[PDB]
């Protein structure tokens, strides 16, 4: 049975009558065994002169809301946004991508540290109730660690 | 309210191919049921040719109740409804 090879970026053009524009997909799963562990699809919001800024909020595996990417970067260790660009921005000569990621910075600006970002993820993390902020952050960190890029680590 | 008068009949004065098939089948089935014969027979063992000969001279005791869309109908004797 022929199946798509995993662990590859798959960016697709989402339908125009939809809040999503481009879906960066990767079936991030353990290379050895070639068995599915998880996957992730980052969806780009907004339009041109329509739909406000080009915000990016992706639904992590087993979370019940599209969480902004800058926020999960805060939750995953790099809370300052310049680190987020150092991870994203690699042709610094471009200004259009800077001004296009500005709305993402604006929306994730409500999150300014790893603790609030991890709690943000955990609230929507589809976990049980009464887990409280501590275990919520711990579970968000685990799900950012396990089942998120499991083929990486 | 049911029968359109023979003069009030505003439809074709000719028999129709559907009427042709119905009349032929009915007459040939009748004579196949040992019904009275309205024409002569030379070698037409199969009743269909006998019914065809009946239709040729139009010696057939049937009458067509052509239903009008409004609900009424026109009664046309075989011998008065012209051959077509």
């Amino acid at each position: 049975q022929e199946r798509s090879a995993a662990n590859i970026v798959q960016v697709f053009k989402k339908a125009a009558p939809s809040p999503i524009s481009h879906v960066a997909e990767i079936r991030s799963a353990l290379e050895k065994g070639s068995r599915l562990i998880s996957t992730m699809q980052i969806k780009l919001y907004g339009r041109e002169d329509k739909g406000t800024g080009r915000t990016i909020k992706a639904t992590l595996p087993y979370v019940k809301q599209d969480i902004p990417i800058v926020i999960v970067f805060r939750a995953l260790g790099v809370v300052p946004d310049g680190e987020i660009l150092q991870h994203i921005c690699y042709d610094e000569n471009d200004w259009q991508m800077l001004e296009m990621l500005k709305p993402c910075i604006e929306e994730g600006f409500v999150i300014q540290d790893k603790e609030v970002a991890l709690d943000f993820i955990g609230r929507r993390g589809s976990a049980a109730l009464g887990i409280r902020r501590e275990k919520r952050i711990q579970y968000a960190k685990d799900i950012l660690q396990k089942e998120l890029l499991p083929h990486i680590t | 309210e049911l029968a359109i008068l023979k003069e009030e009949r505003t439809t074709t004065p000719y028999l129709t191919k559907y009427e042709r098939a119905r009349i032929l089948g009915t007459r040939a089935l009748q004579i196949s049921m040992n019904a009275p014969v309205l024409v002569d027979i030379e070698g037409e063992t199969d009743p269909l040719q006998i019914a065809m000969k009946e239709l040729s001279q139009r010696k057939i005791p049937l009458v067509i109740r052509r239903y009008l869309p409004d609900g009424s109908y026109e009664d046309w004797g075989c011998d008065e409804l012209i051959v077509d």
Binding site: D49 | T10, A21, I23, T45, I64, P69, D84
Partner: protein, 1412 residues
């Protein structure tokens, strides 16, 4: 008849009344109480009485009899039981309706929130429909905040606030908003409460809640008892041969009943609250699964093996369920299916039937006085051979198994007995192939019992089937009654399906061997000798034993192909067609002239012997009939069999090759095209390629290279075709036309050419390359799918893979198109299944509402009209005058005295002059009528009845109208005859004035054409019809016209459906299947919104003013023309500190300093034909001066409009983004672009003829039909919107009908095929006969309110049944679908009447025929 005697009189169902079932009536039909889930009483047969498998409910085996009725399967009709639910439950298809009825009445008093007191509710209740009145009741209940205890004066209401009703799980919950908002007491709405409020409902209330008191009840809508089916319905079904697995229905009934008993146990035991809840919900979804296991959002009831459990809902909706798979489609007997083979020596209307088929299949012949001898011979002959009886049916019904009967031949036949006579030769049988698109796919062939196990057929009859003998399975059906045989012989025969009503043309023609032969035979230098002549004469069925004198006689008698042709041809057939403007001396033997069956000159071709209109087959159809065509098929087929058997014609490799000169012409043509391709590559790669209109630079490159390479392949192919030689069997093949064509030779010999997939070019599949053997951006042909070889040479691996691309493209196209073309066909058939022309002649529905008062506006069938040229319509007015006007006083333009015996009377007479005058101005009036109203621009040849031309020629050749003998017939005779016959034309009979008005409407064109042909002047000056000639001409015209009338009872709706669908079963502007689908789904706007604005004559001959109009129609915002935008916060409100606007604002300025800045494109301004200052002014109007605008100086480097606002960062960007799109600069909105389009519109000539005129026009993209129509310089009375929905919105329903018709007409003409006018005219009128646009969408057809038996049978049957039963509707069994799923005579054609045994004609019989 065959049934055992029953005193019950023979009757059929005339009406079907829907509605719910009361529990009281459920017991009234319940033959036994069912409470035991357990079925087999003691596991030793005799299942449990009172259980699910109660024998009292029915018997299941051969010997056992139903205890209720007394009979087994032989007569056991099935009997029903009842099982009392432990608690009332909900019906799966009524919970939405539970919410509906809970949104209308009181929760305690159980009555409507209003009455007929308010006008809205009263007028809602005046609606006859139950569902509509009840839904309007809802729509007015929602206008009231509370369940009114008084007027919004007590109405007997409870006054408690209506709860917010929600379908909460399986049951519903009502949020009572009791005494800003109280505690929301949403609760389980126990069915007891609903029963209470329903009982509180008054009969007037339920009536105004859309219900019938005597019938379907909201009380009945609550289930209190369930029905237990008869065991016949869910019998012991064999899981393994004898071992029966219990029926799924039995399983589910057991589950439901055990849950019910659990509920019954919930009371007497300790039930701590939630246990009752869980058991009740258990029982509830079990019952739901009884109706529907497919409850959404629920894991369905599933077998322990893992497969889900089914429900009744499933078996009623789908593709092959009850209705689809057992009622509208079900198996038949006396039917066989086997291989097909060719039989060139066989007649057309026969099929070579295997002895196995003709033996196993049989017809019951009743024993009569004439067939007694032969029937007895058949009975004694034996059941295991032919001919022979295998069963002999007694007149009472008894049967004898002849094979098992040891005295098989000892069955003495009684007059009235039936003998299953084995299918003989010449037995008419239905003939069926899958698929069967056109009605010509069902054909009645005569069985010819001949050996081999295939179906032997004629070649010609295979072409309409479009099938072959590569293993196709074909279907034969044997009639079982005399009615059926007569029907087959008179309404479904092979000869009766020769002519396609679709393109009003024959379906059949001479193909293959016979066609190539007849090409090789008719030629001038074909010579035959006495022996071969005499042999074919004996072969010719239509030879009179008399051979004519050979054309060649000395020094040796020799015969020609033409005489041999005429031998097979029975006389009385004349044809004449100039071909390519050939002369009378026909050096090339081209042209065409048959005289009375004898070919004068011209070689017969497939253009005449095929299915082409006006052809020889057309001619025999319209002169002699189908039998003569069948005869001529056999004649030509057998003589060709002889002649080719003796000559033979073949193909070889040397035939497929052309000399090396043309090979090199091919090579250099391809090379030159490659060089042109490289030039285009260079121009594109340096942008030197000029941009094509509506064709982008790279795509322009690709497309033009595609055109160039197609020109390469076609040039090479035409060279190869030119080098094809006379003995070359390849050009002989195409000229013969038995198969193949130009492009075929082009590909085989010269070069295949570019492999064009979906009208494209093979792209670079890899990274910037089509193969790793090619390079990046290899724009040259070899790397993009242009074939450089022919099929002779063989192809390089790369281009071989490209041809694989094209071939797989074609195969996938076919395979995909299958399914959609299929469902399209099925839905179209469903759409118009009952349109029939009644005996009145009007096209109506089953409701009687007239679609069209007449068939095709003329009441004619699609086999009696033919293309006829109305002579008046064309012709210079001077030429028209000197052809139509007479001149008696001056002999220069007079009738010559030789032709008439009364020229002296003619010379100087005035009565004759005034008569011919009146006729002349009559013709002039006809000229106006046609050239200005009916046929306006360029065409004068139209399908009209009665072949006048052939009638005139027939008169000439019968009465010897040659020579210049003087006329014994006077002009008044012609004139009186014409005036009489104009009235003699009868279409709509009756005496009312509208009857004769419709008569005139039907006969207008025919009278005008006859006048254009049969005017006295033409009569005398050309063919001088004598007494006999003229009288028989009039009589024959009248007879043919009266035979040209539509037969009432035709299924013209299904005829139209097939005649439109079959064309669609063969295949950038929206045409073909795309445009078809836009039409059929009734898309509100078509995929190509484009308005064909017709500029005024003076603008239509203008371009630049038309260009200005085009720009004024092309909507322009700054979004189109904004080159760039950079927002500043300008530090000073009245100036700036930036080089880009310093001088500009210094010049313009002579509030909020935040700056709304943007740049505009000067080139885009001038292409828009605007300037940036008017853009600033437009912003001045749209935003006042709140956003202080400027226009920066036009001489400045940057076209800047600073709309200064009057922390302000985010709002500035918001306004900037908004006004980049919401500043309308110029143009008509809704029109993104316009095209500058030619139209070769025909206009008559002042001298009298016609001529084309180039008139410019605007193809405005998008649809703003109203606005472009209001644009100055626009033909408001002609401008069209390609979305006919826009026409409905704008012009109405009549114009929308015309527009839809012309759309479909253009789509039909897109492939080049033709379809008859009247059928798709019926289509478009039905689309419009109800004043709006009706769709073939599922709900759109289901929104109808006829008998549900059709719309439910379409799809989602269960929902339609819920709606109908909730309305307790009535089916009058008037649809044909009701007839077929009840198995009785249909009210169509043969069933469009009631043929009756009479008394007035029976009295004429001799007295001996008296019944005893």
């Amino acid at each position: 008849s065959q049934f055992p005697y029953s005193s019950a009189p023979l009757r059929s169902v005339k009406e079907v009344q829907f509605g719910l079932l009361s529990p009281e009536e459920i017991r009234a039909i319940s033959v036994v109480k069912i409470e035991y889930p357990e079925i087999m009483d003691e596991s030793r047969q005799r299942p449990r009485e009172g259980g699910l498998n109660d024998p009292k409910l029915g018997s299941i085996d051969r010997n056992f009899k139903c205890q209720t009725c007394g009979e087994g399967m032989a007569e056991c009709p099935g009997h029903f039981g009842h099982m009392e639910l432990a608690k009332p439950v909900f019906h799966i298809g009524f919970i939405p309706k539970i919410k509906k009825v809970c949104e209308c009445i009181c929760m305690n008093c159980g009555k409507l929130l209003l009455d007929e007191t308010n006008p809205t509710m009263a007028q809602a209740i005046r609606i006859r429909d139950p569902k509509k009145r009840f839904n309007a009741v809802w729509q007015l209940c929602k206008t009231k905040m509370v369940c009114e205890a008084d007027a919004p004066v007590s109405r007997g209401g409870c006054g408690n606030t209506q709860p917010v009703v929600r379908k909460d799980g399986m049951k519903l919950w009502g949020t009572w908003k009791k005494s800003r908002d109280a505690q929301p007491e949403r609760k389980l709405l126990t069915p007891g409460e609903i029963l209470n409020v329903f009982k509180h409902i008054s009969p007037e209330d339920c009536f105004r809640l859309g219900f019938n008191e005597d019938y379907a009840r909201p009380e009945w809508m609550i289930i209190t008892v369930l029905p237990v089916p008869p065991p016949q319905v869910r019998p012991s079904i064999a899981m393994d041969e004898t071992t029966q697995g219990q029926d799924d229905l039995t399983h589910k009934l057991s589950d439901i009943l055990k849950a019910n008993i659990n509920v019954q146990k919930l009371e007497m035991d300790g039930s701590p609250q939630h246990i009752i809840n869980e058991v009740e919900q258990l029982l509830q979804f079990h019952v739901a699964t009884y109706m529907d296991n497919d409850i959404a959002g629920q894991p369905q009831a599933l077998q322990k093996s893992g497969r889900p459990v089914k429900a009744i809902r499933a078996r009623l909706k789908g593709k092959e369920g009850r209705l689809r798979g057992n009622l509208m489609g079900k198996r038949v007997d006396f039917s066989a299916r086997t291989v097909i083979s060719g039989d060139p020596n066989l007649e057309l209307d026969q099929v070579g039937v295997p002895i196995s088929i003709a033996k196993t299949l049989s017809y019951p012949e009743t024993v009569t006085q004439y067939n007694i001898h032969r029937l007895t011979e058949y009975v004694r002959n034996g059941p295991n051979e032919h001919p022979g009886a295998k069963y002999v049916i007694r007149d009472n019904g008894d049967r004898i198994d002849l094979r098992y009967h040891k005295r098989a031949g000892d069955i003495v036949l009684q007059y009235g007995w039936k003998v299953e006579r084995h299918l003989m030769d010449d037995d008419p049988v239905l003939f069926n192939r899958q698929p069967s698109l056109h009605k010509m796919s069902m054909m009645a062939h005569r069985v010819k019992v001949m050996p081999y196990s295939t179906f032997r057929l004629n070649l010609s009859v295979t072409s309409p089937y479009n099938a072959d003998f590569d293993g196709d399975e074909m279907n034969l059906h044997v009639p079982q009654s005399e009615e059926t045989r007569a029907e087959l012989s008179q309404l479904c025969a092979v000869p009766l399906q020769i002519v396609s009503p679709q393109s009003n043309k024959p379906v059949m023609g001479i193909v293959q061997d016979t066609l190539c032969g007849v090409r090789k035979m008719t030629l001038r230098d074909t010579f035959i000798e006495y022996e071969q002549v005499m042999n074919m004469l004996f072969w010719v069925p239509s030879w009179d034993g008399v051979v004519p004198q050979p054309a060649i006689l000395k020094p040796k008698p020799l015969w020609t192909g033409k005489q041999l042709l005429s031998i097979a041809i029975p006389s009385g057939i004349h044809l004449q067609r100039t071909d390519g403007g050939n002369s009378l001396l026909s050096p090339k033997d081209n042209g065409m002239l048959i005289v009375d069956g004898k070919v004068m000159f011209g070689v017969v071709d497939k253009k005449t012997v095929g299915s082409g209109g006006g052809g020889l087959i057309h001619t025999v159809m319209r002169e002699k009939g189908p039998k003569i065509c069948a005869e001529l098929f056999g004649n030509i087929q057998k003589v060709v069999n002889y002649w080719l058997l003796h000559n033979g014609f073949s193909i070889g490799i040397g035939d497929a090759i052309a000399d090396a000169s043309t090979m090199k012409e091919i090579t250099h043509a391809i090379s030159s095209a490659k060089e042109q391709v490289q030039e285009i590559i260079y121009k594109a790669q340096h942008n030197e390629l000029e941009l094509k209109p509506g064709m982008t630079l790279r795509e322009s490159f690709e497309g033009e290279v595609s055109r160039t390479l197609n020109d390469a392949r076609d040039s090479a192919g035409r060279s190869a075709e030119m080098n094809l030689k006379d003995l070359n069997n390849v050009k002989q093949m195409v000229s013969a036309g038995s198969k193949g064509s130009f492009i075929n030779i082009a590909q085989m010999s010269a070069c295949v050419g570019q492999q064009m997939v979906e009208g494209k070019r093979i792209a670079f599949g890899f990274a910037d390359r089509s193969l790793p053997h090619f390079t990046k951006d290899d724009f040259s042909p070899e790397s993009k799918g242009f074939v450089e070889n022919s099929y002779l040479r063989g192809l390089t691996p790369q281009e071989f893979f490209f041809h694989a691309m094209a071939g797989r493209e074609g195969l996938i196209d076919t395979a995909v198109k299958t399914a959609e073309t299929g469902y399209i066909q099925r839905r179209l058939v469903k759409a118009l299944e009952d349109i029939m022309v009644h005996y009145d002649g009007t096209t109506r529905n089953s409701l009687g509402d007239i679609i069209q008062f007449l068939y095709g506006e003329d009441g004619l069938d699609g086999t009696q009209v033919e293309r006829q040229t109305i002579d008046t319509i064309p012709g210079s007015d001077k030429a028209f005058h000197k052809r139509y006007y007479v001149d008696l006083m001056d002999e220069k333009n007079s009738i010559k005295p030789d032709v008439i015996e009364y020229a002296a009377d003619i010379l100087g007479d005035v009565e004759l002059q005034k008569e011919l005058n009146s006729e002349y101005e009559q013709l002039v009036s006809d000229r106006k009528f046609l050239r200005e109203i009916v046929f306006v621009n360029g065409d004068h040849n139209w399908p009209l009845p009665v072949n006048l031309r052939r009638i005139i020629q027939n008169a000439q050749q019968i009465f010897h109208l040659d020579r210049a003998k003087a006329s014994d017939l006077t002009i008044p005779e012609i004139i009186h005859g014409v005036r009489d016959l104009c009235k003699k034309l009868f279409v709509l009979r009756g005496e009312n004035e509208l009857i004769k008005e419709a008569q005139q409407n039907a006969t207008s064109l025919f009278q005008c054409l006859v006048r254009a042909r049969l005017a006295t002047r033409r009569i005398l000056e050309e063919f001088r019809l004598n007494r006999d000639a003229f009288e028989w001409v009039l009589g024959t015209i009248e007879a043919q016209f009266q035979r040209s009338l539509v037969h009432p009872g035709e299924m013209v709706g299904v005829i139209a459906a097939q005649s439109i669908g079959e064309p669609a079963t063969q295949m950038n502007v929206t045409l073909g299947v795309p445009r078809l689908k836009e039409i059929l789904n009734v898309a509100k706007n078509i995929k190509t919104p484009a308005l064909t604005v017709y500029l005024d004559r003076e603008i239509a001959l203008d371009i630049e003013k038309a260009k200005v109009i085009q720009s004024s129609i092309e909507y322009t915002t700054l979004k189109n023309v904004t080159s760039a935008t950079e927002i500043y916060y300008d530090p000073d409100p009245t100036s700036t500190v930036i080089e880009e606007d310093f001088d500009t604002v210094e010049a313009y300025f002579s509030q909020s300093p935040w700056l709304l800045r943007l740049e505009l494109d000067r080139a885009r301004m001038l292409d828009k034909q605007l300037t940036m200052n008017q853009v600033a002014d437009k912003i001045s109007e749209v935003f006042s001066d709140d956003l202080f605008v400027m226009w920066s100086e036009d001489n400045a480097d940057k076209l800047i409009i600073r709309c200064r606002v009057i922390e302000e960062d985010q709002m500035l960007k918001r306004i900037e983004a908004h006004m980049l799109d919401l500043i309308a600069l110029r143009g008509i909105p809704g029109i993104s672009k316009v095209y500058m389009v030619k139209h070769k519109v025909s206009v008559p000539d002042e001298s009298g003829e016609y001529k084309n005129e180039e008139l410019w026009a605007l193809e405005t993209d998008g649809i703003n039909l109203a606005e472009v129509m209001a644009v100055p310089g626009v033909d408001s009375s002609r401008t069209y919107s390609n979305s006919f929905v826009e026409i409905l919105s704008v012009l109405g329903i009549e114009a929308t009908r015309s527009s839809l018709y012309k759309e479909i007409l253009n789509v039909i003409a897109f492939d080049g095929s033709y379809v008859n006018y009247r059928h798709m005219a019926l289509l478009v009128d039905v689309m419009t006969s109800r004043g709006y646009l009706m769709a073939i969408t599922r709900h759109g057809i289901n929104r109808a309110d006829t008998g549900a038996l059709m719309r439910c049978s379409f799809e989602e049957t269960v929902e339609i049944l819920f709606e109908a039963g909730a309305a307790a509707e009535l089916d009058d069994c008037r649809g044909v679908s009701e007839n077929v799923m009840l198995g009785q005579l249909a009210p169509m054609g043969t069933g469009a009447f009631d043929v009756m045994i009479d008394e007035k004609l029976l009295t004429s019989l001799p007295a001996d025929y008296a019944p005893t």
